[PDB]
Design a protein around this nucleic acid. Structure first.
Length: 174
RNA sequence: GUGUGAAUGAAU
């Protein structure tokens, strides 16, 4: 070849004026690529304690040129970079189940299964209560749930992390 | 508010 790349992730958008909306971030992040989505992130009981956001692009290069310098949003200097929970993977394991992270109340069990069915076929989705940053899903094949883990997926515009589910009952069949 | 995503399940 003549170039290189690496696994993709969302850029954090630190330093927000705590008042800019979510779209206004995509309204400017389009200066680098096509911006698959954006998702402002903050607290869960105050709604006011992380003062940052997330943005995601169609390619990896578009996630390494933004972090090369700062940016001005709504008249406030901010920064973009790689968070402390990604760009640190290699491979998942075999299963018919998968796990989800960074989940939100904007989605639900059916909507997950309606989005996971594009990669093959879904058996079910599960989410315990009360609502938390995670979920689970089951697939119809032992290869779909082994080729979708760690892929930092997206649901209706909510980037969700994915990881290796672990059995609280029964066992694998490898 | 010093800017970081945090959160591994049933039905009996």
């Amino acid at each position: 070849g003549s170039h290189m790349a690496s696994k993709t992730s969302d850029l954090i958008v630190l330093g927000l004026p705590w008042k800019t909306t979510e779209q206004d971030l995509k309204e400017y992040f389009s200066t680098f690529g096509e911006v698959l989505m954006v998702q402002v992130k903050k607290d869960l009981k105050t709604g006011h304690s992380k003062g940052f956001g997330f943005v995601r692009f169609t390619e990896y290069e578009t996630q390494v040129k933004v972090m090369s310098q700062r940016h001005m949003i709504d008249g406030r200097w901010c920064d973009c970079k790689l968070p402390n929970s990604k760009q640190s993977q290699d491979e998942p394991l075999r299963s018919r189940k998968v796990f989800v992270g960074r989940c939100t109340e904007d989605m639900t069990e059916d909507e997950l299964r309606e989005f996971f069915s594009q990669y093959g076929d879904v058996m079910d989705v599960f989410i315990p209560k009360p609502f938390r940053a995670f979920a689970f899903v089951t697939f119809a094949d032992d290869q779909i749930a082994q080729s979708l883990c760690g892929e930092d997926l997206i649901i209706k515009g909510i980037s969700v992390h994915i990881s290796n589910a672990e059995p609280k009952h029964n066992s694998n069949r490898q």
